[PDB]
Design an enzyme around this catalytic site. Sequence first.
Site, PDB file in Angstrom:
ATOM      1  CG  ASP A 486      -1.688   1.342   1.306  1.00  0.00           C
ATOM      2  OD1 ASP A 486      -2.456   1.522   2.273  1.00  0.00           O
ATOM      3  OD2 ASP A 486      -1.540   2.183   0.394  1.00  0.00           O
ATOM      4  CD  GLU A 525       7.462  14.894 -10.564  1.00  0.00           C
ATOM      5  OE1 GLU A 525       6.901  15.277 -11.613  1.00  0.00           O
ATOM      6  OE2 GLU A 525       8.627  15.231 -10.254  1.00  0.00           O
ATOM      7  CG  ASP A 555      -5.052  -0.509   0.413  1.00  0.00           C
ATOM      8  OD1 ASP A 555      -5.854  -1.155   1.124  1.00  0.00           O
ATOM      9  OD2 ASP A 555      -5.122   0.728   0.235  1.00  0.00           O
ATOM     10  CG  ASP A 667      -6.127   3.140   2.985  1.00  0.00           C
ATOM     11  OD1 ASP A 667      -5.716   2.813   1.850  1.00  0.00           O
ATOM     12  OD2 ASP A 667      -6.699   4.235   3.191  1.00  0.00           O
TER      13      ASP A 667
END
EC number: 3.1.26.-
Length: 690
Positions: A486, A525, A555, A667
């Site tokens: 995740d 990025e 996730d 999460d």
Amino acid sequence: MGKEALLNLYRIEYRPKDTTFTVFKPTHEIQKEKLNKVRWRVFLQTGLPTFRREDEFWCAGKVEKDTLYLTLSNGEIVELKRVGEEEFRGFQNERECQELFRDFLTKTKVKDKFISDFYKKFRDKITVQGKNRIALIPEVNEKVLKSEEGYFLLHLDLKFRIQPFETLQTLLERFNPKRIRVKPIGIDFVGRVQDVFKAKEKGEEFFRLCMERSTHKSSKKAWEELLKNRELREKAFLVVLYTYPATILKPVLTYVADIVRMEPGKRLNLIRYILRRYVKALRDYGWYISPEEERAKGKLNFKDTVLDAKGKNTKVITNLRKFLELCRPFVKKDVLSVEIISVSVYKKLEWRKEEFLKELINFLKNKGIKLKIKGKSLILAQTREEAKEKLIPVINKIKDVDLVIVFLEEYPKVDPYKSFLLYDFVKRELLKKMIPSQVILNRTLKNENLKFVLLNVAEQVLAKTGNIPYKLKEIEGKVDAFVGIDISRITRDGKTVNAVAFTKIFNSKGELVRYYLTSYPAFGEKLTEKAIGDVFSLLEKLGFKKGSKIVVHRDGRLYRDEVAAFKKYGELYGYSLELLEIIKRNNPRFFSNEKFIKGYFYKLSEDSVILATYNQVYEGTHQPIKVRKVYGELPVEVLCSQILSLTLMNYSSFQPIKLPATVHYSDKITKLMLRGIEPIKKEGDIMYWL
């Protein structure tokens, strides 16, 4: 299988008599992101429902203008060249059907006519008084999905939101606010509060920027307010959930309380109703919407046999309660240090805790684990001073031990806006402290069976501490590992800032081989390439070599870039990969009387499935999850079954768990480790999160 179960999904179809549509190709190239904007403007300017194909834009009607000049938001002028007319032959994807369907709902206003009448014909009390100052907003959404079969499905679902006909700017003049689900007036998003500050503090040019970067009549006019008025600029607070002014934020409230939308029976029939009108409003236009709900295709079979360190398995000793009593843990950490925190009202005495503790320590001694106690911390309290009194024992001397046990008392309160309860509190605070914890409610020690509880904990405790009591005997299909990752990214404008990524690797038997929680402050990025990278690096540093089958569990939703990184590196380490997204939010819901629906499924189109991963041993409406195979050479039936099996690894066989050990509490941790300049670089082999 078992006994029939229903899904709020209804076959939908559009076979109009007048199959004539007017298509318009652009002059330049499809800016894609703008395309779904350009379609919206085409709708308005054209007054005709519209849907987009590749570049073509089809209008449910006759339009004469050998060219349209729609003006986007950027003020940008796009020119659409009307090509001939076409004979409509069914939609291609769900997006088309959905785009076109959602237009009608608008040109028709049917949805609003409903919300209109719902309010009147029911405002009889969708509002409450109380002594503190309450509404009942009826949110309603339409989704369109495909299905293994081939037909489209209208996903109709209704939920109610409750918020005070009051605002935040008013409450910050009366309490906390902290973690409070809020909602911006003219915006469709529910965020959490972080830290409220004074608005004057931001000089003036601050209000300038954002006042132009606004795309909401609400936000805009709200920013302009403060900007062209130093008067108010002082007296008002600016809340940072992204961030807006407290003058346009209404708290979204969760569940004195005599206004409940009650059980599913009605819920379904309620949507059943809404479905009817819709029909009546779109029948004359060629839309056919089936009145019968969709049902689970069937139940799925998964390997659910576990075994201990001696072979004793549940295929034989069937009584799980008995199993646990006889299991021989795969002990690894032979001696545990543990702190005991005890919250109790008044100057009472709890032999009950002492009894249990002795029984636990002893019951674990019989398993071969010496649970050496280190510190005891008694807390007396009658309110929520506990938070104020525990905020210490916790963030205090509690500096790495193997576990912390907490005996909680529960108080009658309710923070009218914020969510507070010692359980969630203690837990979250120990999660940050990254310490495995066992909260034991005193209410449970007083009324339950010390024996069924002793077991109930033991199992939890063993796992949380690296002494798992059992593991799967096997799982369907040849897999060498199950990875669950995740990646959550803090985005304060532009493209990212920093991020966090949690990875958990389990072997083929469901044993957690290793976890890796880490944050990545960044320049460019290129955080995915790296993030995903560290995972493969860890897979080789763990013992998996060329030829290995890896099943990954993303996730949330998998992003195009992550998928490529996986396939990318997977090529470099020569690993076979199967990619999966596991959507746990806004999914269709099952409506059944079966109870034992775990494994009940509904197959969607693009290798997606709606899976019930838990037995509903809680009230009525069951919330399944969505499983989509993004990449891989294994049937989804297997991947689904593997997920079911891995449900067992959350070592909680008395309280149903929804998510697989691979993404359970991801999460949460990930979303939780996003605070301050907190630099984390930790890996371990203990399921402390449980």
